[PDB]
Enzyme design. Structure first.
Site, PDB file in Angstrom:
ATOM      1  N   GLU A  40      39.091 -18.460 133.465  1.00 52.66           N
ATOM      2  CA  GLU A  40      39.036 -19.562 134.420  1.00 52.66           C
ATOM      3  C   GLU A  40      40.377 -19.748 135.120  1.00 52.66           C
ATOM      4  O   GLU A  40      40.422 -20.085 136.310  1.00 52.66           O
ATOM      5  CB  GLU A  40      38.625 -20.855 133.712  1.00 52.66           C
ATOM      6  CG  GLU A  40      37.167 -20.913 133.289  1.00 52.66           C
ATOM      7  CD  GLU A  40      36.878 -22.099 132.386  1.00 52.66           C
ATOM      8  OE1 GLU A  40      37.108 -21.985 131.162  1.00 52.66           O
ATOM      9  OE2 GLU A  40      36.436 -23.148 132.900  1.00 52.66           O
ATOM     10  N   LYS A  99      41.094   7.607  95.639  1.00 52.05           N
ATOM     11  CA  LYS A  99      42.326   7.516  96.406  1.00 52.05           C
ATOM     12  C   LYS A  99      42.121   6.653  97.651  1.00 52.05           C
ATOM     13  O   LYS A  99      41.080   6.742  98.308  1.00 52.05           O
ATOM     14  CB  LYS A  99      42.818   8.915  96.776  1.00 52.05           C
ATOM     15  CG  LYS A  99      41.869   9.720  97.637  1.00 52.05           C
ATOM     16  CD  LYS A  99      42.438  11.099  97.909  1.00 52.05           C
ATOM     17  CE  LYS A  99      42.397  11.972  96.666  1.00 52.05           C
ATOM     18  NZ  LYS A  99      41.001  12.287  96.254  1.00 52.05           N
ATOM     19  N   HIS A 136      18.658  -1.656 104.063  1.00 53.11           N
ATOM     20  CA  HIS A 136      17.912  -0.890 103.069  1.00 53.11           C
ATOM     21  C   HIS A 136      17.643  -1.814 101.885  1.00 53.11           C
ATOM     22  O   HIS A 136      18.355  -1.817 100.881  1.00 53.11           O
ATOM     23  CB  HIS A 136      18.680   0.363 102.658  1.00 53.11           C
ATOM     24  CG  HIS A 136      18.971   1.297 103.792  1.00 53.11           C
ATOM     25  ND1 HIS A 136      19.224   2.639 103.604  1.00 53.11           N
ATOM     26  CD2 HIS A 136      19.055   1.085 105.127  1.00 53.11           C
ATOM     27  CE1 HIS A 136      19.446   3.213 104.772  1.00 53.11           C
ATOM     28  NE2 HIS A 136      19.350   2.292 105.713  1.00 53.11           N
ATOM     29  N   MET A 150      15.604   5.266 100.046  1.00 50.95           N
ATOM     30  CA  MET A 150      16.658   5.794 100.897  1.00 50.95           C
ATOM     31  C   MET A 150      16.632   7.316 100.874  1.00 50.95           C
ATOM     32  O   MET A 150      16.420   7.929  99.825  1.00 50.95           O
ATOM     33  CB  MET A 150      18.023   5.286 100.434  1.00 50.95           C
ATOM     34  CG  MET A 150      18.144   3.775 100.437  1.00 50.95           C
ATOM     35  SD  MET A 150      19.843   3.210 100.603  1.00 50.95           S
ATOM     36  CE  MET A 150      20.615   4.138  99.281  1.00 50.95           C
ATOM     37  N   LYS A 177      21.017  12.278 104.069  1.00 46.56           N
ATOM     38  CA  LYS A 177      21.160  13.051 105.297  1.00 46.56           C
ATOM     39  C   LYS A 177      21.598  14.485 105.038  1.00 46.56           C
ATOM     40  O   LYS A 177      21.919  15.201 105.991  1.00 46.56           O
ATOM     41  CB  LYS A 177      22.153  12.371 106.241  1.00 46.56           C
ATOM     42  CG  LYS A 177      21.670  11.047 106.802  1.00 46.56           C
ATOM     43  CD  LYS A 177      22.695  10.441 107.747  1.00 46.56           C
ATOM     44  CE  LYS A 177      22.242   9.086 108.261  1.00 46.56           C
ATOM     45  NZ  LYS A 177      23.244   8.474 109.174  1.00 46.56           N
ATOM     46  N   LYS A 203      23.003  -2.074 107.350  1.00 47.79           N
ATOM     47  CA  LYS A 203      23.615  -1.267 108.395  1.00 47.79           C
ATOM     48  C   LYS A 203      24.457  -2.153 109.303  1.00 47.79           C
ATOM     49  O   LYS A 203      24.004  -3.215 109.740  1.00 47.79           O
ATOM     50  CB  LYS A 203      22.547  -0.545 109.210  1.00 47.79           C
ATOM     51  CG  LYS A 203      23.113   0.332 110.310  1.00 47.79           C
ATOM     52  CD  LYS A 203      22.014   0.945 111.156  1.00 47.79           C
ATOM     53  CE  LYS A 203      22.592   1.692 112.342  1.00 47.79           C
ATOM     54  NZ  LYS A 203      23.358   2.893 111.911  1.00 47.79           N
ATOM     55  N   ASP A 225      42.779  28.456 116.591  1.00 40.39           N
ATOM     56  CA  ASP A 225      42.003  28.786 117.775  1.00 40.39           C
ATOM     57  C   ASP A 225      40.614  28.180 117.658  1.00 40.39           C
ATOM     58  O   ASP A 225      40.046  28.094 116.567  1.00 40.39           O
ATOM     59  CB  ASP A 225      41.892  30.301 117.973  1.00 40.39           C
ATOM     60  CG  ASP A 225      41.412  30.674 119.361  1.00 40.39           C
ATOM     61  OD1 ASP A 225      41.527  29.833 120.277  1.00 40.39           O
ATOM     62  OD2 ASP A 225      40.917  31.806 119.539  1.00 40.39           O
ATOM     63  N   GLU A 247      47.617  26.148 120.991  1.00 42.72           N
ATOM     64  CA  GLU A 247      47.521  26.733 122.321  1.00 42.72           C
ATOM     65  C   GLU A 247      47.661  25.625 123.354  1.00 42.72           C
ATOM     66  O   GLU A 247      46.961  24.610 123.277  1.00 42.72           O
ATOM     67  CB  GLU A 247      46.196  27.477 122.502  1.00 42.72           C
ATOM     68  CG  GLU A 247      44.974  26.675 122.093  1.00 42.72           C
ATOM     69  CD  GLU A 247      43.685  27.267 122.621  1.00 42.72           C
ATOM     70  OE1 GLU A 247      43.392  27.084 123.821  1.00 42.72           O
ATOM     71  OE2 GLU A 247      42.961  27.911 121.833  1.00 42.72           O
ATOM     72  N   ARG A 298      34.030  42.093 122.194  1.00 43.73           N
ATOM     73  CA  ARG A 298      33.428  40.969 121.486  1.00 43.73           C
ATOM     74  C   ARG A 298      31.923  40.979 121.719  1.00 43.73           C
ATOM     75  O   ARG A 298      31.456  40.704 122.829  1.00 43.73           O
ATOM     76  CB  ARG A 298      34.042  39.653 121.952  1.00 43.73           C
ATOM     77  CG  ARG A 298      33.444  38.436 121.278  1.00 43.73           C
ATOM     78  CD  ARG A 298      34.237  37.186 121.596  1.00 43.73           C
ATOM     79  NE  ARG A 298      33.829  36.067 120.757  1.00 43.73           N
ATOM     80  CZ  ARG A 298      34.562  34.982 120.552  1.00 43.73           C
ATOM     81  NH1 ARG A 298      35.743  34.827 121.126  1.00 43.73           N
ATOM     82  NH2 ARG A 298      34.100  34.032 119.745  1.00 43.73           N
ATOM     83  N   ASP A 320      36.529  35.052 116.265  1.00 41.68           N
ATOM     84  CA  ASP A 320      37.373  33.873 116.118  1.00 41.68           C
ATOM     85  C   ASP A 320      38.596  34.182 115.267  1.00 41.68           C
ATOM     86  O   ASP A 320      39.688  33.654 115.524  1.00 41.68           O
ATOM     87  CB  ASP A 320      36.568  32.726 115.513  1.00 41.68           C
ATOM     88  CG  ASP A 320      35.208  32.570 116.160  1.00 41.68           C
ATOM     89  OD1 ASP A 320      35.094  32.827 117.376  1.00 41.68           O
ATOM     90  OD2 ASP A 320      34.251  32.190 115.453  1.00 41.68           O
TER      91      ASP A 320
END
Length: 1244
Positions: A48, A694, A737, A743, A746, A797, A845, A930, A1163, A1200
């Site tokens: 304001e 830890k 949950h 549950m 994943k 969650k 890399d 790099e 390659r 790689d």
DNA sequence: TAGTGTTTGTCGTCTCATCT
RNA sequence: AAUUUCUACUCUUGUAGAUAGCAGA
DNA sequence: AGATGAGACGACAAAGCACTA
């Protein structure tokens, strides 16, 4: 010089954050007093109050611009000369001329212009001085000047409260600044509007000269409106009138003479802007403009050079074709002996000039016009098909989000198309076309921000992290922790049973009441209050508190005999006249500073004055109230001190101290109950009762700040200027949950392969027996492999944002005893590296089959270890999770998926930072990244180009500025007391060179497609050869191709002094090469898995769609097949290429060229079959070609591995150049030719 | 005639023109 | 799916790593 | 193209003034 000696080198400051949990009845008292609601009202009065405060800036700036009268003739001549000659001398002349005019406008603001009298000139300085601090709120600046009464009220509202306006003060300095910044008023006048106004005057006189009847017609338009009644039409197009075009009201009148948060918010606003495009008929106007290009003069329709390469890639084979076609046609029309200098002039001209559309068509052919017509109608039809397509009702479903993005892509596509044409008036633009184009270009301009605003509406998390600071009506709350300033600031710390509590004392009933806690014995149960004792810096505090007192100075000025001070002193302090005289001489260099001795040489008087000053300082420290007892005797004798610098560097650490005193629990609890103290436990999930394992690094910093060893000898300082915040709960849909549900993990049973997101959600829905749809076949097959979990306890969650949370931002200074800033860090790094020639190298890399790949090499170049960082802490990022994310992108192509991919990349790079620093500390090696300046990564790599990776390098530098390992003990170097200092402080992405401490940067290109055994690289640019004659010339360049009957391998001897037109211009070492076609025998690796030698993977299927699908290829097999089919004998070992040329068969020659390209392709990768390897087409001194499929431990495992290994070798090249060079300087970058020569000389 | 609530002291690093 | 808060996650009412906040692009 | 150099800004307790008795 041990590697462990890179510690305690320079101070580093970090700001820790914690969540405050109110303790006892403190929350009830805060709510009763309404501190939270008043602070919410304060941050909202910000918006304001912001427009009210802006009235001061707007009025003062407008008033200063009304008196501006300048002669713009010099600026016009500098603009003309730069457009005339495009030389760097005329550019710098214009840059200086613009800076001169910007300062001329700036002198009206600050009051240093010769055009105004001293009375008016000085009045502006009194305003501009207090224009960016608390004097805005005095009403004083407004008293010099225009506002509502609500203004008085709300500006009085932040008196002694301008903290929030900090960054706002900088934004307003950007408005009045004289620098070459686009946020400023002088820049807008000199470099934005005047070139427009100057061009308007030129357009005017050209029309009036050709069509004089247009003069009276323009005059009638000006008279019929009523603008500029005192100014004729010729004068408004003359330079002196621009002085009256510096204010908005005048700019608006000038332009009118020419012109005459929610889901439905994005739908209502876009549809409002969308329905506006129909009424203006911008599509019909745009479709008519591009249809004009079929008949109008195209030599005056110009394409911008900034877009020419983009247009070439969108309408032709490559980005090269247009620039190259224009190059050939311009060389075609040069005069006389076309030197190589004349060709380079044509090249440089094509980089920075606008090309007319006719020269493009005359150079590219009729097939560009067909591409231009097809692309134009394609974009126009999509925009036309999107304006009539209605938006959905909500953004709830993804199918409704897709059509919103689809219509925005069509709108941005048309906006992209219009930016193809040059906008600058330097070219001879068409009268009607440039006016109609600029009109619809500015009417399509808001569509760009609508694309970004809409993508941000739906790429945002459901949270609301917005927070406002809490002041408790305390202007300097938590400004400093000192016990003396405790009453004035009202903020203290406690500690009890390993739990740290923050307490603040608010003003009592609008008045300041000081809580005097009574310390007790440690046997008494209760809290432990931090007694922060500080004395900022002797160099400034001792003169201020002793001899720069106004009373002392007045007494010495008026009276000569020494004065005694009995205020704020345990025992009176005797101050003589001579000490003041030495501290207050008649010259700028005092006898205390080294400047006096440097410019005089009076070393004896210098030392005597220094000794007297140090004795007075010691006496003051002894006699002062707060420093009378703090271990002053630990200092060395005053006589031998070299200068004040070392004495103050020794004295400052002794002044700062933190002590703890036990306070009875009952007193603190009663103070909390009464409302005198607001307790706040500091919580960061590492103080929770369920904690095991830890902790975080910030928790370690906080714990080690108050460690007994840190208290005894300071290494982490507790700085002031702390802040408190408050985050209102932002819940829009609560999911948890709950107990009794199921549950789903994943991860699969292997704990390393994540489930695909959609499959995971479907399986989770099915397991709870709440899924209506039947399981898909892939989900049904995946179900036996997954593990489900019962709900032991509720898990909400996003529980962080289901309730209002307080917050506490406290800054700390790690490595307090070190210097303020690093001093030649790179020189010390180079000295350590030179004295330790055996320090290994770490090369990082970005691979294609893995996100980050690392190899470490010793001093001799042998691979010590090659590891894949794509799996971190038992989780596969590249091989599994990023692959499913890319599959989801390919299936949907939404915005939220891309945002989640970016966030996942950032998190993965954080884990990669941890792994890199761990490997660094284990090997004590120097890490070689790099630099993103050179080269770019293909789309096959997991990590994007320069967007995420560049931030990763900055994060790694910041981490290595102060590196602490949580497994290390605090006492040992590397712990929370003595962190590693291995890199210099980050400054800027462009400012950082090839070295930053133990971080080296080497050019990206020419590190992956290199033979690790020989250093051989594919020299031919296969895009150059297009026709049959080019193939003939390329094939005749090689010496011979004889089939070795004994081994079954074809040998194609090649010399770098041939086919220079097709080479890339990098000879390097090894003037001659022997390309070998491996006989397709089944070789076996260490694991015994067979593989066909010489196998090649090629994507060439069709000329244009040469990347549709990979194809298997064994060059020897089809080579001998073609030779047998063509009726040419080769078993005798004779040369084959001349026979191939004699055959004069186009199919055979083209297939031979393709075979050479395939065999020279090293390659070879195939994601479908999980294949990724490099095969050397040439033999080394051992007589065998490299094959990464052999999986030799001493050589790179895959492509790689090759990239990371050669990055490590580039870093080793840099280190060796440093070692051989006498100076401690690293060469700025490595040339591709130099790197190739070095590697080929090393391997051979 | 007290008493309750923003400036200063000097040193450090940045930041634009600039001699060499 | 629980975080000073960002990523990934769950044998562990939490785990591994990172985290310099303020104001503003 | 690396420098010196004038000027400005961060650090924070304590000195030291703006309002009220």
């Amino acid at each position: 010089t041990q590697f462990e000696g890179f510690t305690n080198l320079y101070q580093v400051s970090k700001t820790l954050r914690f969540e405050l949990i109110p303790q006892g009845k403190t929350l009830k008292h805060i709510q009763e007093q309404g501190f939270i609601e008043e602070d919410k009202a304060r941050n909202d009065h910000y918006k304001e109050l912001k427009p009210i405060i802006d009235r001061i800036y707007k009025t003062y700036a407008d008033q200063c611009l009304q008196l501006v009268q300048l002669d713009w003739e010099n600026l016009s001549a500098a603009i003309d000369s730069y457009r005339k000659e495009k030389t760097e001398e005329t550019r710098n002349a214009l840059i200086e001329e613009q800076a001169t005019y910007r300062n001329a406008i700036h002198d009206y603001f600050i009051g240093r212009t010769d055009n105004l009298t001293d009375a008016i000139n000085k009045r502006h300085a009194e305003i501009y001085k207090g224009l960016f601090k608390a004097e805005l709120f005095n009403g004083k600046v407004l008293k010099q000047l225009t506002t509502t009464e609500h203004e008085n009220a709300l500006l009085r509202s932040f008196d002694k409260f301008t903290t929030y306006f900090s960054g706002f003060y900088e934004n307003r300095k950007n408005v009045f600044s004289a620098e070459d910044i686009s946020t400023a008023i002088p820049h807008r006048i000199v470099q934005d509007n005047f070139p427009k106004f100057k061009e308007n005057c030129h357009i005017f006189t050209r029309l009036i000269t050709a069509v004089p009847s247009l003069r009276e017609h323009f005059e009638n338009v000006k008279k019929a409106i009523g603008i500029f009644v005192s100014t004729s039409i010729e004068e408004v197009f003359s330079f002196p009138f621009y002085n009256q075009l510096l204010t908005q009201t005048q700019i608006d009148l000038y332009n009118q003479l020419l012109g005459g948060k929610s889901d439905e918010e994005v739908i209502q606003s876009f549809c409002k802007y969308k329905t506006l495009l129909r009424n203006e008929n911008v599509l019909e106007t745009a479709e008519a403009l591009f249809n004009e290009l079929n008949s109008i003069d195209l030599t005056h329709i110009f394409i911008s050079h900034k877009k020419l390469e983009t247009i070439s890639s969108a309408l032709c084979d490559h980005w090269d074709t247009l620039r190259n076609a224009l190059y050939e046609r311009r060389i075609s029309e040069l005069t006389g002996k076309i030197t190589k200098s004349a060709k380079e002039k044509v090249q440089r001209s094509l980089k920075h000039e606008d090309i007319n559309l006719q020269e493009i068509i005359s150079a590219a052919g009729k097939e560009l016009s067909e591409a231009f017509k097809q692309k134009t109608s394609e974009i126009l039809s999509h925009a036309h098909a999107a304006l009539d397509q209605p938006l959905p009702t909500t953004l709830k479903k993804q199918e409704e989000k897709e059509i919103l993005k689809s219509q925005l892509d069509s709108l941005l596509g048309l906006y992209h198309l219009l930016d193809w044409f040059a906008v600058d008036e330097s070219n001879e633009v068409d009268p009607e076309f440039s006016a109609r184009l600029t009109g619809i270009k500015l009417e399509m301009e808001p569509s760009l921000s609508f694309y970004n605003k809409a993508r941000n509406y739906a790429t945002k998390k459901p949270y609301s992290v917005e927070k406002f600071k809490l002041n408790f009506q305390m202007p300097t709350l938590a400004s400093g922790w000192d016990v003396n300033k405790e009453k004035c600031n009202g903020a203290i710390l406690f500690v009890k049973n390993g739990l740290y509590y923050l307490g603040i004392m608010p003003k009592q009933k609008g008045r300041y009441k000081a809580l005097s806690f009574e310390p007790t014995e440690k046997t008494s149960e209760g809290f432990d209050k931090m007694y922060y004792d500080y004395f900022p810096d002797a160099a400034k505090m001792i003169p201020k508190c002793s001899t720069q007192l106004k009373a002392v100075t007045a007494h010495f000025q008026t009276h000569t005999t020494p004065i005694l001070l009995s205020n704020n002193f345990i025992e009176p302090l005797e101050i003589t006249k001579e000490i003041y005289d030495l501290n207050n001489p008649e010259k700028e260099p005092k006898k205390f500073q080294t400047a006096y001795a440097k410019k005089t040489g009076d070393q004896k008087g210098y030392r005597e004055a220094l000794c007297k000053w140090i004795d007075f300082t010691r006496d003051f420290l002894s006699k002062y109230t707060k420093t009378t007892s703090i271990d002053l005797s630990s200092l060395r004798p005053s006589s031998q001190y070299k200068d004040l610098g070392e004495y103050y560097a020794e004295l400052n650490p002794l002044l700062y101290h933190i002590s703890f005193q036990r306070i009875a629990e009952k007193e603190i609890m009663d103070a909390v109950e009464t409302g005198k103290l607001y307790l706040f436990q500091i919580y960061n999930k590492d103080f929770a009762k369920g904690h095991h394992g830890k902790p975080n690094l910030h928790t370690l910093y906080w714990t080690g700040l108050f460690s007994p060893e840190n208290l005894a000898k300071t290494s982490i300082k507790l700085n002031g200027q702390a802040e408190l915040f408050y985050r209102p709960k932002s819940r829009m849909k609560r999911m948890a949950h709950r107990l009794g549900e199921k549950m789903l993990n994943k991860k699969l049973k292997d704990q390393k392969t994540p489930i695909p997101d959609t499959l995971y959600q479907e399986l989770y829905d099915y397991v709870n027996h709440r899924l209506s749809h039947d399981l898909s076949d892939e989900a049904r097959a995946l179900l036996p492999n997954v593990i489900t979990k019962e709900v032991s306890h509720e898990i909400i969650k996003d529980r962080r944002f289901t309730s209002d949370k307080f917050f506490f931002h406290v800054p700390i200074t790690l490595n307090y005893q070190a210097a303020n800033s690093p001093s030649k860090f790179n020189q010390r790094v180079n000295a350590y590296l030179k004295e330790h020639p055996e320090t290994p190298i770490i090369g990082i890399d970005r691979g294609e089959r893995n996100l980050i790949y690392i190899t470490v090499i010793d001093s001799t170049g042998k691979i010590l270890e090659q590891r894949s960082l794509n799996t971190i802490q038992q989780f596969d990022y590249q091989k599994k999770l990023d692959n499913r994310e890319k599959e989801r992108v390919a299936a949907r192509q939404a915005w939220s998926v891309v945002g989640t991919i970016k966030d996942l990349k950032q998190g993965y790079l954080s884990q990669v930072i941890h792994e890199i620093v761990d490997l660094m500390i284990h090997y004590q090696a120097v890490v070689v990244l790099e630099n993103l300046n050179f080269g770019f990564k293909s789309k096959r790599t997991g990590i994007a180009e320069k967007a995420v990776y560049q931030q990763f390098e900055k994060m790694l530098i910041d981490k290595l500025n102060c590196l602490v390992l949580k497994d290390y003990p605090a006492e040992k170097v590397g712990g929370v007391l003595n962190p590693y200092q291995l890199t210099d402080q980050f400054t800027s992405f462009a400012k950082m060179g090839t070295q930053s401490g133990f971080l080296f940067y080497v050019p990206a290109p020419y590190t992956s497609k290199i033979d690790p055994l020989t250093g051989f690289v594919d020299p031919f640019v296969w895009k150059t050869i297009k026709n049959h004659e080019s193939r003939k010339h390329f094939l005749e360049g090689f010496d011979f191709l004889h089939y070795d009957v004994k081994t079954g391998d074809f040998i194609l001897h090649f010399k770098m002094n041939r086919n220079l037109s097709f080479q890339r211009g990098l000879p390097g070492f090894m003037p001659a090469w022997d390309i070998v076609f491996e006989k397709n025998e089944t070789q076996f690796d260490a694991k015994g898995t067979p593989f066909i030698a010489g196998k090649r993977i090629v994507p060439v299927i069709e000329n244009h769609r040469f990347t549709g699908r990979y194809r298997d290829l064994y060059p020897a097999n089809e080579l001998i097949a073609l030779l047998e089919e063509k009726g040419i004998v080769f078993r005798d070992g004779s040369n084959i290429l001349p026979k191939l040329l004699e055959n004069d068969d186009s199919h055979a020659i083209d297939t031979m060229v393709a075979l050479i390209r395939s065999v020279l392709q090293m390659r070879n990768s195939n994601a479908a079959t999980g294949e990724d390897y490099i095969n050397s087409p040439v033999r080394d001194l051992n007589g065998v070609c490299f094959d990464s499929r052999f999986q030799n431990p001493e050589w790179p495992m895959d492509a790689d591995a090759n990239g990371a290994y050669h990055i490590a070798l580039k870093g080793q090249l840099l280190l060796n150049h440093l070692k051989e060079s006498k100076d401690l300087k690293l060469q700025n970058g490595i040339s591709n030719q130099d790197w190739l020569a070095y590697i080929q000389e090393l391997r051979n």
